[PDB]
Design a protein around this nucleic acid. Structure first.
Ligand code: A1BB1
Ligand code: ANP
Ligand code: MG
Length: 378
RNA sequence: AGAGAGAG
């Protein structure tokens, strides 16, 4: 039930070569618990702290199950955003590099004719996608579910939310009745867990109490801003005060991302911005330029709150507080990846500091006032 | 009715 070495998981030699080439050495806590029941075919609900390696948990399990000589799609992974799907596809391709497993991204904002021409010719072993384009390709029969034996929902509690649950159900109805289902997330509320009883067969539950989700390496602070009209000057002050690797600044609406980005540019501050109403060509460039370090400060919506992994991010600023409790955990988790040291700063008006106290109580955490004029907080 | 989530 606990297997502390990749060497003891009965993985193929090519899969192990790919794991070690990517730079892993020992499995994370969640990997030691969840890879083997997934390989064995059990329905699994896998929860673990942000940044602990849930991607490779399902990636390694899918790869080990692939029948390489079967030229058909055998596994389908869904993610809530295009950026997250693209990121998962790269991890899966890297881990399976020595196996020649094929992994295809089925995501919106890409040219449909080009995808259709690829899928008319080849049946990728592994599909990583977003729900809209996946449902589209299933309806037009360019993706076949005939041999899909593994269905993975990353960020599963978001995928089973009001906005996505019906999309996931529509896709699920296309799949064979015997398909294995694997769910992963940092957050798994009891109401989402009840929805899983409707479609998962007596799953293995690896769950983490909410009071244990917060990372020790992510120091959480708040700043009394009192008035919303004062947030902009506070941000500008934090730009000049704080030591700057890379930072993500979260905003609750696309409209306000656009507003804030213009305000910062007018004041000669260098920032980039991304949200879901931008052309996908622009999203791809912005994401690429943040990954490379060309841009160090990104203003974004919850488009980038879940799953995105930029190791150099050490600072998250909640310029708007998240209304949703679960979202708070995902946001601050963009800093402090795989045990790195991070800071999260919450900007709080009078009306916000209630919402803040409820977050503190729910997660049994403590959020401290940010020191004055301290450049290096943690 | 936030954020995302095919297409045109
Ligand atoms: C027939 O093939 C499809 C494929 C995809 C889609 C959809 O994919 C979307 C993705 C989007 O990304 C920006 C936007 C978007 O609409 C503005 C849609 C949808 N297009 C339309 C017209 N309606 C949608 O909103 C669908 C939806 O959720 N509802 C409640 O309407 C049924 C949605 C969907 C349904 C099942 C499974 C996955 C996704 C509908 C029908
Ligand atoms: N065994 C491992 N050894 C070293 N690094 C690892 C290992 N497993 C995963 N990582 C790295 O850990 C980082 C976070 O992995 P990722 O899979 O994005 O985390 P996660 O659990 O899905 N986080 P989140 O989606 O926000 O809940 C990545 O940079 C991985 O490459
Ligand atoms: Mg993840």
């Amino acid at each position: 039930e606990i297997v502390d070495s990749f060497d003891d998981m009965n993985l193929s030699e090519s899969l192990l070569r790919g794991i070690y080439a990517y730079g892993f050495e020992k499995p994370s806590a969640i990997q030691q618990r969840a890879i083997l029941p997934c390989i064995k075919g059990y329905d699994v609900i896998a929860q673990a702290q942000s940044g602990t390696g849930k991607t490779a948990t399902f990636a390694i399990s899918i790869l080990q199950q692939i029948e390489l000589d079967l030229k058909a799609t055998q596994a389908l992974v869904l993610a809530p955003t295009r950026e997250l799907a693209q990121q998962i596809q790269k991890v899966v391709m890297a881990l399976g590099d020595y196996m020649g497993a094929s992994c295809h991204a089925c995501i919106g904002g890409t040219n449909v004719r080009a995808e259709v021409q690829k899928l008319q010719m080849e049946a990728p072993h592994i599909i990583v996608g977003t729900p809209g384009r996946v449902f589209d390709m299933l309806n037009r029969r360019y993706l076949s579910p005939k041999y899909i034996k593994m269905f993975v929902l990353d960020e599963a509690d978001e995928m089973l939310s009001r906005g996505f649950k019906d999309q996931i159900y529509d896709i699920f109805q296309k799949l064979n009745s015997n398909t294995q289902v694997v769910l992963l997330s940092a957050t798994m509320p009891s109401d989402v867990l009840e929805v899983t009883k409707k479609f998962m067969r007596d799953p293995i539950r690896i769950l983490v109490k909410k009071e244990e989700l917060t990372l020790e390496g992510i120091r959480q602070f708040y700043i009394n801003v009192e008035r919303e009209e004062w947030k902009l000057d506070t941000l500008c002050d934090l730009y000049e005060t704080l030591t700057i690797t890379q930072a993500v600044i979260f905003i609750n609406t696309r409209r306000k991302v656009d507003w804030l980005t213009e305000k910062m540019h007018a004041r000669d501050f260098t920032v980039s911005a991304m949200h879901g109403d931008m052309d996908q060509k622009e999203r791809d460039v912005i994401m690429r330029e943040f990954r490379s370090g060309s841009s160090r400060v990104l203003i974004t919506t919850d488009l980038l709150a879940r799953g995105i992994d930029v190791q150099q991010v050490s600072l998250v600023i909640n310029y708007d507080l998240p209304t949703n409790r679960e979202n708070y955990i995902h946001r601050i988790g963009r800093g402090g990846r795989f045990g790195r040291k991070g800071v999260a700063i919450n900007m709080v008006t009078e009306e916000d500091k209630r919402t803040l106290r409820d977050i503190e109580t729910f997660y049994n955490t403590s959020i401290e006032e940010m020191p004055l004029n301290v450049a290096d907080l943690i």
